[PDB]
């Protein structure tokens, strides 16, 4: 009918996927055992005897993260094929996970992907989750997209990655893995979404009433954005938007492929009784810088793309009122060459809640995706970070011995500079 494939690499990707498939199971009414107590074909396969299987593959170079799913309650749902795990993690090294160890299991991963690709009659996109700072997430992901680019060619390759935080960093060599992965993504990926952990921590502290969140709370917020994104194909709606339609509208240039994500309403289980939750109210909350899933101020640049998807009772009449109201805001700047600016989508499925959830049972919600020059602010910090250690050559020998040729480091540096120049030139009115 129309099928999508999801693949998860590098711890963070898997745990986000665990949240997503928990959310999808409840949304469609599928028990963890796979039986029923619809539109399954969009994400699940009816294997007969009442059991269903997800269209996803989990691959990690170490078994700890995958063994969590194997020994968890989720184990009865996933095919044992889809739970591939390695023998030795890449250990924060891009070179190690791309050359020495990545090629050991990369052929195994592709065969299982192609095997599921046989069952997808109308396969029109892929969903890939990365952690840029990770060695496995960046190194293995680069090789896999390069292989997948020639395997299928004209097929949508959507990425969902986690950018290093402006100040929070869990890996010391993280800028090394971030730039090298970015240089490889920039040629093959159709469109890669951008989020960071620090903005998730701040939004979870302010909006939600959580004194001390964990990775589970962050993943569930991400999972809701994924569900809202994929609801257009899964359910009937007054304005359904296809994956290829996102590709046409979101990235109106050659190689600018990094939008930012926003989601509203994000309210406590306590306040919203005291609030009107109007579509005009939630629309205005989307554009306020405090709600961005990336820690970059839009006032440092301008917008050139917007995409709003409404989950709920949102009548199309009010949507036109909301977007017209937004254009009157002087705090929001739109580039001259994008008079239209927006792509709307209205779907009748309400938001999905989770037992023990961190969010309220709101009637209506809207997911926002926006491409803006403000991401260049994030580039400059990564560029300056990399230049500081590499001037003194802080970690060259670790990568070189693992298959990295030293000539590749300046090449990826210049590729980032070309991205920065391209972003800056687009921001100039003509």
């Amino acid at each position: 009918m129309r099928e999508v494939i999801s693949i998860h690499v590098g711890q963070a990707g898997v745990q986000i996927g665990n949240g997503c498939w928990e959310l999808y199971c409840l949304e469609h009414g599928i028990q963890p055992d796979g039986q029923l107590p619809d539109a399954f074909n969009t994400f699940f396969s009816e294997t007969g005897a009442g059991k269903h299987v997800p269209r996803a593959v989990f691959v990690d170079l170490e078994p700890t993260v995958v063994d969590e799913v194997r020994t968890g309650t989720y184990r009865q749902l996933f095919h044992p094929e889809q739970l591939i795990s390695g023998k030795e993690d890449a250990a924060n090294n891009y070179a190690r996970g791309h050359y020495t160890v990545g090629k050991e299991i990369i052929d195994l991963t592709l065969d299982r992907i192609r095997k599921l690709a046989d069952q997808c009659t109308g396969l029109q996109g892929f969903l890939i989750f990365h952690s840029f700072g990770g060695g496995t997430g960046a190194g293995f992901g680069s090789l896999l997209l390069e292989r997948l680019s020639v395997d299928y060619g004209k097929k949508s390759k959507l990425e969902f990655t986690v950018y290093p935080s402006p100040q929070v960093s869990t890996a010391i060599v993280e800028p090394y893995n971030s730039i090298l992965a970015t240089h490889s993504m920039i040629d093959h990926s159709d469109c890669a979404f951008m989020v960071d952990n620090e903005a998730l921590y701040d939004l979870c502290r302010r909006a939600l009433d959580i004194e001390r969140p964990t990775y589970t709370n962050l993943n569930r917020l991400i999972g809701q954005v994924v569900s809202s994104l994929t609801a257009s194909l899964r359910f009937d709606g007054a304005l359904n938007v296809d994956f290829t339609e996102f590709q046409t509208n979101l990235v109106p240039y050659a190689r600018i492929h990094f939008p930012i994500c926003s989601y509203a309403p994000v309210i406590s289980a306590e306040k919203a009784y005291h609030e009107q939750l109007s579509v005009a109210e939630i629309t205005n909350s989307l554009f306020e810088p405090a709600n961005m899933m990336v820690k970059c101020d839009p006032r440092h640049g301008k917008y050139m793309a917007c995409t709003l998807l409404y989950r709920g009772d949102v009548v199309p009449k009010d949507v036109s009122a909301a977007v017209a109201t937004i254009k009157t805001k002087r705090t929001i700047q739109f580039v001259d060459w994008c008079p239209t600016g927006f792509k709307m989508g209205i779907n009748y499925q309400p938001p999905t809640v989770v037992p023990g959830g961190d969010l309220a049972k709101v009637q209506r919600a809207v997911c926002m995706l926006a491409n803006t020059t403000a991401i260049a602010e994030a580039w400059s910090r990564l560029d300056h970070k990399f230049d500081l250690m590499y001037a003194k050559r802080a970690f060259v020998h670790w990568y070189v011995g693992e298959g990295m040729e030293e000539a590749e480091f300046p090449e990826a540096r210049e590729d980032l500079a070309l991205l920065e120049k391209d972003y800056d030139e687009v921001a100039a009115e003509s």
Binding site: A269, E270, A272, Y273, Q276, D313, A360, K361, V362, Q363
Partner: protein
């Protein structure tokens, strides 16, 4: 002995978990009448009330 008990903490929070759904805003308005003007129905009742009172009563 002293008796002082009250569990507002649960009452506020458990209720706040359940009945979250705000702003029903039911879109049940239909156009099919305005193209099918019911003025005929209102005058039908107006004549019916007029005839009953003037003639029968």
């Amino acid at each position: 002995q002293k008796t002082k008990t009250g569990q507002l903490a649960k009452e506020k929070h458990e209720a706040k978990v359940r009945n979250m759904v705000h702003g029903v805003s039911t879109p049940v308005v239909s156009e099919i009448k305005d193209c099918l003007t019911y003025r005929t129905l209102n005058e039908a009742l107006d004549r019916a009330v007029r005839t009953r009172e003037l003639q029968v009563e």
